[PDB]
Amino acid sequence: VDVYGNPIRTQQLREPQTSRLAGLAKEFAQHPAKGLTPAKLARILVEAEQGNLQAQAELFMDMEERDAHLFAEMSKRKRAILGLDWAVEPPRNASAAEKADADYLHELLLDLEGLEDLLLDALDGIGHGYSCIELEWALQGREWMPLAFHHRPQSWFQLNPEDQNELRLRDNSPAGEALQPFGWIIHRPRARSGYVARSGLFRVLAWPYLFRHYATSDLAEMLEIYGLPIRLGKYPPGTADEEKATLLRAVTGLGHAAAGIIPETMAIDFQQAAQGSSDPFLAMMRQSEDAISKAVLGGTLTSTTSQSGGGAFALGQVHNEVRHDLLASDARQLAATLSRDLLWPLLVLNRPGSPDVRRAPRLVFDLREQADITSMAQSIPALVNVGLEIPSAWVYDKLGIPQPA
Amino acid sequence: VDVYGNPIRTQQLREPQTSRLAGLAKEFAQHPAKGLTPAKLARILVEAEQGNLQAQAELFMDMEERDAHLFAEMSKRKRAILGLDWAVEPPRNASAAEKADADYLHELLLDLEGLEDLLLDALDGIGHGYSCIELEWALQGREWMPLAFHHRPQSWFQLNPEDQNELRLRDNSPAGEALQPFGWIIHRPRARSGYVARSGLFRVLAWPYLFRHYATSDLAEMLEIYGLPIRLGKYPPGTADEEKATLLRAVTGLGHAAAGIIPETMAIDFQQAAQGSSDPFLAMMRQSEDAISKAVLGGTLTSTTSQSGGGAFALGQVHNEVRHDLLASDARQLAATLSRDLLWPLLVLNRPGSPDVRRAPRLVFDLREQADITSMAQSIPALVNVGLEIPSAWVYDKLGIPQPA
Amino acid sequence: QFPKLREWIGQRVIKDMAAQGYQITNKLFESTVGVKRTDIEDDNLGVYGPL
C-alpha cells in the first residue's frame, strides 16, 4: 500500500489516469491576465477559494510570463534548489537489509533520467501552491520502472466539495475524480498555514504585479502623448466644409511642420499636452519590485541588498540568515514530498516483503555549508596539543572531505 | 491524566472531536478585509474582545495574504524557528528509567512524519494569538500513535462566556464546546500580558496595515488620473443635442488627439488634473513598513538595519541583542507547548506506570550560538600552561564538537 | 461549427460561422428556522441543538 494506507492495485498502473480524459489534452489557456482590473482579480481569487482553480492557475501562468522581475526571482529561487547535490540515506540505525534497500534505491535514482525535470516541475508548487506530476509505470521484466514524468497543468484540477484540502481531476462531474494512488507526485509547499487554494505565493504577489502593470502601462501612454503640444484651431462663421477640412489637416500636420499660414480671422491655440514627470510611476514600480523581492527571496539580499564585502565569514553572513533558511526549507519540503511519493512505490514494488512505513529510506539534500578550511586548520593543532580528542568523523563530514576507504 | 489533571478516557480518542460537526468543514471565509474602514476595523477588534473571534481570524488571514512586507517578515520569523535542531532531554538528574523513557520519546519524534508541518502550524499562533492542531490517534497493536496533525482555522473557535481565557468550539450553542483532552495541541505565545483575544501580534499590526493599504490605493488612483488634463467644452445657446454630442466626443478624444477644430463661438479650457507628488504617500508607506518591521523582528536589524560589517564578533553583534532574544523566546515557548501537549500523552499512553508530572521529559531546541574557534583555541593553551584545569565537557559542549564515544 | 469541407473547382467560398450565445440569470434560495435561545441549553438528550 501507499504511505496513507489506501489499498494499492497494480492493475491500474498500466495506463495513466488521465488517458480516459482525452478532452483535457485539447484545451487551451484562456489568458485571464489580459484586461485585468482589481475587481476582476478579487473575483478570481474569491472564486478560487471556492474550488474554481482553473482561472487562478491560468492567471498565475500569465503573471509568471508577463513580469520579468517576478520571473527572474522565481527562476533564481528554483535554480538554487536544482543545483544541490542529493543522496538517499537509510533510516535511523538501519539494519543490513535496510541499508541494501537504501543503496538499491540510490542507484535507481542515479540512473533514472529526467530527475532534474521532475524537480523543476515539482518546484512550480512554490508559486502555484500545488504541483501534480503524472507517472508512467512500465515493467522491464519483474521490476516496475517510472517510464516518464508528466507535469499536468494546475488548471486540470479542482477542490472536493466535501473537502477543501483534497484535489480532484476535472471529469465534467461536480465532484471531479479522486487522484489515483501511485499515479502522481503532488508537491504542496506550505509558506502559510491554510487551505490549498490560499497556499500559493502568487496569491501574495498578485497585487504588486497589478500595481506595476498599471504603472508601466500608464507611463507608456504618457510617453506616447509626450512631445508636441495639442493645438486647437478656430474658424469664423461662414467657413465651408472644404475649408474646415483644410484647417483640420493643417492643424493635424502643424506639429511636425515647422511653419504654416492661416487667415487673420482664424486662430490656433497651443495647449499643454502632458506636463509632469516619471517620478510617481517609477516610485510605484520600485515599491512593487521591492515587495516582490522581499516576498520571494527575503529583504536582506534582494530588495535591501546586502551590498559587497568579502571575507572568510562573508559566506556565512550572506547565507545563514534568510538565504540558508529559505534554501533549507525548500529543500526539506521537496525531499519529504519525493520520499513520500517516488521512493515508497519503488521500495514496495521492486523489492520483496512489506517493510514498515516508519523505516522507509528518506531522500536527503546536501545542505552542507562551506566551512573556512584555513581558520579551522589553524585551530585544530592547538586543541589537539591541549589534549582534546576530537573525532575524525566530525572533521571529515564538516569539511566535505570523504573518509578514507 | 493530562498535565492539567483533567480525567483522560481512551474511548474518545478513536474519533476526532470535530467529526460530529460536519457543518464546520463546509464553511467559507467571509473575507472581511475587502472594503475595510477604520470604523469597521475598530468594531471587529472590539467584537473579538467579547468572544467573536471568527471575524478577527478571517481579517487576520486576509491581512497576511494581502500585505507582501508583513507576509515576508512573518515567514522569515517562522522559518528561523523551523531551521533549528532539537533534542529531547531527561529531567534534572534523571534515573535510568527516566533516561530510557526520554530516549524512546526522542526516537519516536525522530521517526514521526509531519513534525515540520506541526511546528509551522503551531507558529501561526504568534500572529493569530492561538493555534489549534487536532490529533488523530491510532493503535498499531498496543502502542498509541499520532496518525496525523490537522490544523483547524482560528475561526472555528470562540471564548467561553464564563471565562475569557478558555477557548471552545463553535457547535451552534451559546457556550460552544470544551476542548477534548489529548485531542489538540494549543499554542498560545504571549507577547503581551492579557487575555487570549488581545494577545495576537496582528492586533498590533492591524493599523499600520490599514494605513499602508489606504496610501497605496490612493497612490494608484492618483497615478490613474495623472497624464492628460481635464478639459471642459462650452457651447452657446442654440446648440442642438447632436452638436452637443459631437462636442462631447471631441472633448473626450481631444487628449489623445493632437489637434482639433471648433467654431469660434465654442471654447475648451484645459484645467489642472492632479498636480503634486508621490512624496506623502511614499512617506506613509515607509512609516508603516518600518513600524511593521520593528514590531515583528525588532528595530535593530530590519527597520533600522544593522548594515554590513564582518568580523569574528560580527555574529554575536548581529544576533545576541534582539535576534537571539526573539529566537530564544519563540523557541522556548514552542518547546514548552510541545512538551505539554505531545510528549505527555505519548509518555502516559505508550509506557507503563504513572510517572510524576514534574519529572516528565522536556523538548529542548538547540539555541547554541556559533563561538569563535580560532580566538578561543589561541586562548586555551595560555590558560592550561598557567595551571587552570578547564573541564573538557564545557569545551565540547560550547564548540558543538561531540564527546568521544 | 465550421461549414463542411466542400469540393474545389474554380474558387473558394469564404464562409462564416454562427453563434448562439445563451443568457440565464441567478436566483437566491434560503431556509431558516427560529428557535429559542434558552431551549437549546435546556436539554439533556442532545436534541434541538443539532437541528
mmCIF file of N, CA, C and O in Angstrom, chain A residues 21 46 55 66 71 73 82 99 123 129 132 150 193 209 221 235 261 266 271 274 322 335 347 354 358 393:
data_model
loop_
_atom_site.group_PDB
_atom_site.id
_atom_site.type_symbol
_atom_site.label_atom_id
_atom_site.label_comp_id
_atom_site.label_asym_id
_atom_site.label_seq_id
_atom_site.Cartn_x
_atom_site.Cartn_y
_atom_site.Cartn_z
ATOM 1 N N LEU A 21 -9.478 10.671 -20.376
ATOM 2 C CA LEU A 21 -10.000 12.034 -20.329
ATOM 3 C C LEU A 21 -9.418 12.853 -21.477
ATOM 4 O O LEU A 21 -8.903 13.958 -21.297
ATOM 5 N N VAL A 46 -11.445 35.038 -5.064
ATOM 6 C CA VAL A 46 -12.554 34.538 -4.255
ATOM 7 C C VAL A 46 -13.118 33.258 -4.856
ATOM 8 O O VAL A 46 -13.405 32.293 -4.138
ATOM 9 N N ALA A 55 -9.216 29.296 -13.366
ATOM 10 C CA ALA A 55 -8.927 30.699 -13.637
ATOM 11 C C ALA A 55 -7.708 31.166 -12.856
ATOM 12 O O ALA A 55 -6.872 31.909 -13.382
ATOM 13 N N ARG A 66 4.372 37.448 -17.889
ATOM 14 C CA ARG A 66 4.330 38.859 -18.256
ATOM 15 C C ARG A 66 5.176 39.762 -17.367
ATOM 16 O O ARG A 66 5.336 40.941 -17.695
ATOM 17 N N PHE A 71 9.550 36.762 -12.734
ATOM 18 C CA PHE A 71 10.046 35.548 -13.368
ATOM 19 C C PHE A 71 11.508 35.310 -13.021
ATOM 20 O O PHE A 71 11.907 34.175 -12.735
ATOM 21 N N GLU A 73 13.137 36.349 -10.329
ATOM 22 C CA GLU A 73 13.232 35.940 -8.929
ATOM 23 C C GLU A 73 12.856 34.474 -8.757
ATOM 24 O O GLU A 73 13.570 33.710 -8.093
ATOM 25 N N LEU A 82 17.834 23.409 -7.756
ATOM 26 C CA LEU A 82 18.205 22.463 -8.804
ATOM 27 C C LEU A 82 19.695 22.143 -8.786
ATOM 28 O O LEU A 82 20.108 21.093 -9.290
ATOM 29 N N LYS A 99 19.899 -1.108 4.767
ATOM 30 C CA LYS A 99 20.999 -0.459 4.063
ATOM 31 C C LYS A 99 21.045 -0.893 2.604
ATOM 32 O O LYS A 99 21.275 -0.069 1.711
ATOM 33 N N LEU A 123 8.883 22.011 -8.207
ATOM 34 C CA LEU A 123 9.100 23.317 -7.596
ATOM 35 C C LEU A 123 8.086 24.360 -8.048
ATOM 36 O O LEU A 123 8.001 25.424 -7.426
ATOM 37 N N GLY A 129 1.173 26.838 -5.478
ATOM 38 C CA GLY A 129 0.588 26.249 -4.297
ATOM 39 C C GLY A 129 0.433 24.746 -4.349
ATOM 40 O O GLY A 129 0.216 24.123 -3.305
ATOM 41 N N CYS A 132 1.288 18.822 -9.662
ATOM 42 C CA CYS A 132 0.956 17.419 -9.865
ATOM 43 C C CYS A 132 1.727 16.887 -11.063
ATOM 44 O O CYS A 132 1.662 17.463 -12.152
ATOM 45 N N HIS A 150 5.248 13.294 -16.243
ATOM 46 C CA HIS A 150 4.448 14.259 -16.986
ATOM 47 C C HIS A 150 3.876 15.276 -16.012
ATOM 48 O O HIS A 150 3.206 14.902 -15.043
ATOM 49 N N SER A 193 0.008 28.925 6.671
ATOM 50 C CA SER A 193 -0.916 27.914 7.171
ATOM 51 C C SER A 193 -2.324 28.209 6.665
ATOM 52 O O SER A 193 -2.847 29.309 6.875
ATOM 53 N N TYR A 209 1.998 42.877 -8.586
ATOM 54 C CA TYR A 209 2.075 42.717 -10.033
ATOM 55 C C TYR A 209 1.089 43.639 -10.737
ATOM 56 O O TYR A 209 1.435 44.279 -11.735
ATOM 57 N N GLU A 221 1.688 55.121 -21.954
ATOM 58 C CA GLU A 221 0.727 56.031 -22.572
ATOM 59 C C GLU A 221 1.199 57.478 -22.472
ATOM 60 O O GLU A 221 1.135 58.239 -23.447
ATOM 61 N N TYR A 235 -12.376 78.680 -36.289
ATOM 62 C CA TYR A 235 -12.766 79.280 -37.553
ATOM 63 C C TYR A 235 -14.020 80.118 -37.373
ATOM 64 O O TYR A 235 -14.831 79.849 -36.480
ATOM 65 N N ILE A 261 0.640 79.090 -42.483
ATOM 66 C CA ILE A 261 -0.035 80.376 -42.604
ATOM 67 C C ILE A 261 -1.540 80.155 -42.575
ATOM 68 O O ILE A 261 -2.054 79.217 -43.192
ATOM 69 N N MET A 266 -8.834 83.397 -38.508
ATOM 70 C CA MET A 266 -8.731 82.129 -37.809
ATOM 71 C C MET A 266 -7.780 82.267 -36.624
ATOM 72 O O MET A 266 -7.181 83.319 -36.390
ATOM 73 N N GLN A 271 -2.080 74.272 -26.517
ATOM 74 C CA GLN A 271 -2.371 73.961 -25.128
ATOM 75 C C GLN A 271 -1.431 72.869 -24.627
ATOM 76 O O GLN A 271 -0.928 72.047 -25.396
ATOM 77 N N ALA A 274 0.952 67.093 -21.915
ATOM 78 C CA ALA A 274 1.116 66.321 -20.696
ATOM 79 C C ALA A 274 2.384 66.797 -20.007
ATOM 80 O O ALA A 274 3.490 66.532 -20.480
ATOM 81 N N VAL A 322 18.318 34.234 6.347
ATOM 82 C CA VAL A 322 17.497 34.407 5.154
ATOM 83 C C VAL A 322 17.818 33.343 4.109
ATOM 84 O O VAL A 322 16.985 32.470 3.838
ATOM 85 N N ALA A 335 12.321 17.235 -0.512
ATOM 86 C CA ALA A 335 12.809 15.906 -0.169
ATOM 87 C C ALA A 335 11.720 15.076 0.495
ATOM 88 O O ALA A 335 11.590 13.881 0.219
ATOM 89 N N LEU A 347 10.187 1.111 -3.415
ATOM 90 C CA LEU A 347 10.518 0.162 -2.359
ATOM 91 C C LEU A 347 9.477 -0.945 -2.262
ATOM 92 O O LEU A 347 9.825 -2.118 -2.080
ATOM 93 N N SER A 354 7.153 -6.615 3.108
ATOM 94 C CA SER A 354 6.323 -5.456 3.432
ATOM 95 C C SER A 354 7.012 -4.673 4.542
ATOM 96 O O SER A 354 6.611 -4.747 5.710
ATOM 97 N N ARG A 358 7.457 3.410 8.771
ATOM 98 C CA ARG A 358 8.318 4.282 9.564
ATOM 99 C C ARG A 358 9.794 4.074 9.256
ATOM 100 O O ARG A 358 10.603 4.967 9.529
ATOM 101 N N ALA A 393 35.601 11.765 12.370
ATOM 102 C CA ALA A 393 34.366 11.718 11.591
ATOM 103 C C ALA A 393 33.739 13.099 11.474
ATOM 104 O O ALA A 393 33.281 13.490 10.393
#
